[PDB]
C-alpha cells in the first residue's frame, strides 16, 4: 500500500487496493419438501412427536399468510436495481406452469437446469430430506393416530430433519419475504459451492469467490416464491463478481482551515470515499456502506457507482489549478477532528484544542503544532485530541508527502456567502 499525504488540501490517497466488482446476478431456485404433514394427527394427548409435528404444521401454514449529494443518489439506485432484478425474476417463476415445470425437472434427481418462459436460465435444487423422512418412516410409525409411541428414536430424529425447514421459515417470516443475506439455511455450504461453480464467468473469478464465499453469501439475498402443495419454493440471488484485480484507491480528507488577521477560513474536500478504475474509465463509489475491504481486496457493487470524468484525478495533484470542478465545502468556523487512514491519521487541530501523539513504549512523544498534520503509524501508536484517544492502523506500507502551501492559505476567500456546502472550489476562493 502506498499512501500520499496531499498538504495542498489536507487529504490522503491510498493506492494499491484490488477491486472485486459485482457485475450481475445468478439465480438458484430451491424446492424444499415437507411431505404430507398436513394429514397427520394425534389422538393421544401431549407427546414428543405431537409437539414437533405441531411445529412443522404451524410453520408450514404460516408461510401462506406471508406476502448533488452523490452518497444519497447512488445507494437508492443500488437497492432499486437489486430489488427489481429479484422481483422481476420471481414474478416469472411464480406461475403455476413454471412451478410444475421446476418440480418436473427435479422429479428424478436433486439438480436440474431450467429455462423460464421469460428466457432466463436458472439452476434448480431440491432439498428433499424432510419429505423422505415424513413419507418413508414417520407415516408408518404413527399407526391409528397413536403418536405417543414407545420408541424415542423417532422423536429425536424428527427434531433433526425439520430443523432446517423451521429456520427457513423463521428468516422469511421476520423479513416479509426478502431476506437481507443468504443464511446458512437457505443455501448450505455444499449447495453454495456447487452454485458458484456454474456462474457465467471465467475460472479466475470463480476460484476467488470459492475462497471467499462468506462475502458472496453476505451480499446475496433470497425471495420467497410461495408454498405450493407441500413444497416450499424460494430463490437465491448470488452476486457475480465478474471483474477482479483492477486498481482502486481511497480518498480521505480533513478540514484545511487556516487563519489571517485572526479570522479562520476553511476548506474540506467532499469527494471522499472509494474510486476504482475499470477498462479505461473511473467509477466513484460514494455510498458509505457499499464498499468493504479485506486486506488489499475491496468488494464493491457496480450499481452503486457514479461515473466520473477521468480528469477528476487532478483534484489529487494540483487542485489549486485544475480546471475540473473539485467539490469542496467552505466555511469560517474550524472543526478539530482526526480522520484515520489505512497507514496513518490526519490530525486537524485548531484554536482551543490540545493535540498530542503517544506510543506503547512511552505514553507521550510530542504535542502537535496547530493546523493540519499527518501522523504516521510508524511514528506513533496513538494520537489524542482533548482527552480522546485513537489507535492507529499498524499495517506496514510506504508513505509520501506532496509538498505545497495549502489552498486555504494561498487564496483570499469570497466575502459573501461563505459557508457554501458542496460547491466547486472556484466558487469560494480568488473571488
Amino acid at each position: 500500500l502506498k499512501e500520499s499525504y496531499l498538504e495542498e488540501s489536507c487529504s490522503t490517497i491510498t493506492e494499491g487496493y484490488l477491486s472485486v466488482l459485482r457485475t450481475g446476478w445468478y439465480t438458484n431456485v430451491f424446492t424444499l419438501e415437507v411431505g404430507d404433514v398436513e394429514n397427520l394427527t394425534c389422538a393421544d394427548g401431549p407427546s414428543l412427536i405431537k409437539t414437533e409435528l405441531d411445529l412443522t404444521k404451524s410453520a408450514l401454514r404460516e408461510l401462506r399468510t406471508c406476502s448533488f449529494v452523490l452518497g444519497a443518489i447512488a445507494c437508492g439506485v443500488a437497492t432499486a436495481a437489486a430489488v427489481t432484478a429479484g422481483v422481476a425474476i420471481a414474478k416469472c417463476i411464480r406461475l403455476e406452469s413454471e412451478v410444475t415445470a421446476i418440480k418436473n425437472c427435479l422429479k428424478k434427481t436433486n439438480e436440474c437446469v431450467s429455462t423460464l418462459g421469460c428466457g432466463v436460465r436458472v439452476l434448480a435444487t431440491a432439498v428433499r430430506e424432510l419429505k423422505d423422512f415424513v413419507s418413508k418412516n414417520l407415516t408408518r410409525a404413527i399407526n391409528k393416530n397413536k403418536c405417543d409411541i414407545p420408541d424415542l428414536k423417532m422423536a429425536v430424529s424428527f427434531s433433526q430433519f425439520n430443523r432446517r425447514f423451521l429456520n427457513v421459515v423463521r428468516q422469511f417470516s421476520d423479513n416479509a419475504g426478502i431476506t437481507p443475506a443468504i443464511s446458512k439455511d437457505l443455501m448450505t455450504d455444499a449447495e453454495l459451492a456447487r452454485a458458484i461453480s456454474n456462474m457465467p464467468t471465467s475460472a479466475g473469478q470463480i476460484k476467488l469467490m470459492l475462497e471467499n464465499r462468506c462475502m458472496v453469501r453476505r451480499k446475496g439475498f433470497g425471495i420467497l416464491i410461495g408454498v405450493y402443495g407441500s413444497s416450499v419454493i424460494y430463490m437465491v440471488q448470488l452476486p457475480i463478481f465478474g471483474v477482479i484485480d483492477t486498481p482502486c484507491w481511497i480518498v480521505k480528507a480533513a478540514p484545511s482551515c487556516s487563519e489571517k488577521k485572526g479570522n479562520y477560513a476553511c476548506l474540506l474536500r467532499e469527494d471522499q470515499g472509494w474510486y476504482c478504475q475499470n477498462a479505461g474509465s473511473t467509477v466513484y463509489y460514494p455510498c458509505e456502506k457499499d464498499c468493504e475491504t479485506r486486506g488489499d481486496h475491496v468488494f464493491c457493487d457496480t450499481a452503486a457507482g457514479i461515473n466520473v470524468a477521468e480528469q477528476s484525478k487532478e483534484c489529487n495533484i494540483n487542485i489549486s489549478t485544475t480546471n475540473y470542478p473539485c467539490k469542496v465545502s467552505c466555511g469560517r468556523h474550524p472543526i478539530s477532528m482526526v480522520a484515520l487512514s489505512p497507514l496513518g491519521a490526519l490530525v486537524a487541530c485548531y484554536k482551543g484544542v490540545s493535540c498530542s501523539i503517544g506510543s506503547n513504549r512511552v505514553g507521550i512523544i510530542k504535542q502537535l503544532n496547530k493546523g493540519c498534520s499527518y501522523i504516521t503509524n510508524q511514528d506513533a501508536d496513538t494520537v489524542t485530541i482533548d482527552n480522546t484517544v485513537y489507535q492507529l492502523s499498524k499495517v506496514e506500507g510506504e508513505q509520501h508527502v506532496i509538498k505545497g502551501r495549502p489552498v486555504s492559505s494561498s487564496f483570499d476567500p469570497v466575502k459573501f456567502p461563505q459557508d457554501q456546502f458542496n460547491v466547486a472550489l472556484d466558487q469560494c476562493f480568488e473571488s
Partner: antibody
Amino acid sequence: LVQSGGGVVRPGTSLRVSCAAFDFNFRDYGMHWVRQAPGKGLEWVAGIWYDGSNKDYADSVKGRFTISRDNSQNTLYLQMNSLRVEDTAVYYCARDPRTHREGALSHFDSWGQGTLVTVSS
Amino acid sequence: ELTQDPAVSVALGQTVRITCQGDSLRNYFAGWYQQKPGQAPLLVLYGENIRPSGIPDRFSGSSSGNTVSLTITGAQAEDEADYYCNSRDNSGNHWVFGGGTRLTVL
C-alpha cells in the same frame, strides 16, 4: 438412452448415430458427442447448444460431420459423410451441465452406453 | 493441449495423486472421469473439488497454477481404472481430453 445406427460400412459412405429416450428433459441441456477408438483414449467430436445454435467440431471432422437435434421428439443426431477408416470408434452421447455458455465448467455427465461404429475393407 | 502420466501404481490403502497438466486449465475447470474396461466413462470429479452424488467420499481434487490433481485416499482395489481429465481450450469452443492414466492397485 436408446442409441442406434451403429454398424459397419466400407469407407466412403454415410451413416447416422442417433441418441434418444433421454431420462432427463433433453431440452434445456447442451449435448456433445465423444468417441473412443478401440483401446485408445477419448476424443471429443462435436457439440451443440440447447437452442440448436453453436454447432462446432473438432478439426479431425470439421468438414464432414453434422450435429443436429430435435427438441420436439427428444433426439440427437450425428450424421457422417465421407466416412474414413480412422473414424472407427465407440460413439458416446453426453450431456452439458452449463447454465450459461460463458461459464467456466467443462466436464460432461450422463454418458450414454456405447454405440459401436465400425469401418472396414 | 492436456497431458498426463501414462501409468501410475499405488499400494493398496496408500494414497496416490494423478495429475493433469495443460496451459488452458488457468481459465477453465477440469472434469475427471474414470473408465473401467468396456463401460462408458463415469464422472468422478469436476470443478474445484466437487463430487457428483454417489461417488464415494474418498476421491478429492486439488489444483494450482496450470495443474490439477485427483487424490485417491485409501486407494481400494475397485479404484483400478483409466482416469481421464478434460477441459476446454483457450478458444472456449473445443474440448480436449488427456491421454488417460492407467492406474493399477497392488
